[PDB]
C-alpha cells in the first residue's frame, strides 16, 4: 500500500513553522488545498503542548469545521477525550494522542466509538529505568493493546516513536537505528522527524529549520525502507514525491 503523507498545519507560530500567516481560517483552507495538491494524504492540525477543554476546542474547532469536508483525512493533536470526541463528531478521521492515551484513558473508547484512527506517540519527561528502545516498545505495545481492547483494529493504531520527546539526541539516534524493531510490532508506524533537533544533528553545520527539509526527506526514504507507513512532514511536496518513488522501488522487491 502507499506511504501516507501527513502534512503539518499549525494554527500558531512555532520555531519550525516557516512563513507566518497563522490563525487565519481562510488562509488555513488555502494552505490545506495547497498541501492536498502537493500530495498530502493527512492534514495534522497542531494542538496544545494547561488551558481548559472549552478553551482547547475554541482553538481547533474553527479550522476543523472548514477543512473536514475536503478529500483528505483530518488529524487533530489532542490528548484529552473531551476535545477528541467533539472533533470526531465533525468528521475528523485521526486523533493524534501525543501521550499515547496515558493522560486520558477514555481516549481509546472515544476513538473506537467513532470508528476512527489513533496515533500513539512515545512521550515522557526523559526518565526511564530501561534502554530507550525497550522502554519505548514496552510503553507503546501496552497502549496499542488498550486501543485494541476498546475495539480499534490494529491497522488503525499508529505508533509514533516520538522523536524530539523524552529522548536525548543520542537516544533518538538509537531509536532511528532500530526502526525495524518498532515496525516489527505490526502496527503502522508514523515517523515524525521533520525539522526537529535530530535533523539538525544530521547536519555537520548549524542550520535553520527550513534548511533541514532535505535531511528530513532522507529520514522519510530511510523510514519507508524500514517499513514505516506514514511520515509527518512540513514540506509535503518534497517528501510526497520522494515517498512515491521509494514506494515504487520497495514494492518492486
Author numbering: 2 to 50, 57 to 260
Paper text:
Sulfonamides target the enzyme dihydropteroate synthase (DHPS) that catalyzes a key step in microbial folate biosynthesis, the production of 7,8-dihydropteroate from para-aminobenzoic acid (pABA) and dihydropterin pyrophosphate (DHPP).
We crystallized SaDHPS F17L/E208K and determined its structure in the absence of ligands (apo) and with our previously published inhibitory pterin-sulfisoxazole conjugate compound 1530 (respectively). In the published SaDHPS wild type structures, Phe17 within loop1 is either distant from the active site locale or missing. However, in our two F17L/E208K structures, F17L and loop1 adopt a conformation that is similar but not identical to the known conformation of loop1 in the near transition state (compare the position of Phe17 in Figure 5A with the positions of Leu17 in Figures 5B,C). In the wild type SaDHPS structures, Glu208 forms a salt bridge with Arg176 and the adjacent Glu179 forms a salt bridge with Arg204. Arg176 and Arg204 also interact via a π-stacking interaction to stabilize this 4-residue cluster. Finally, disruption of the Arg176/Glu179/Arg204/Glu208 salt bridge substructure may introduce some local flexibility to facilitate the distortions of the pABA-binding site caused by the F17L, S18L, and T51M mutations. The kinetics, sulfonamide susceptibility, crystal structures and modeling all present a consistent picture of how these two mutations work in concert to efficiently produce high levels of resistance.
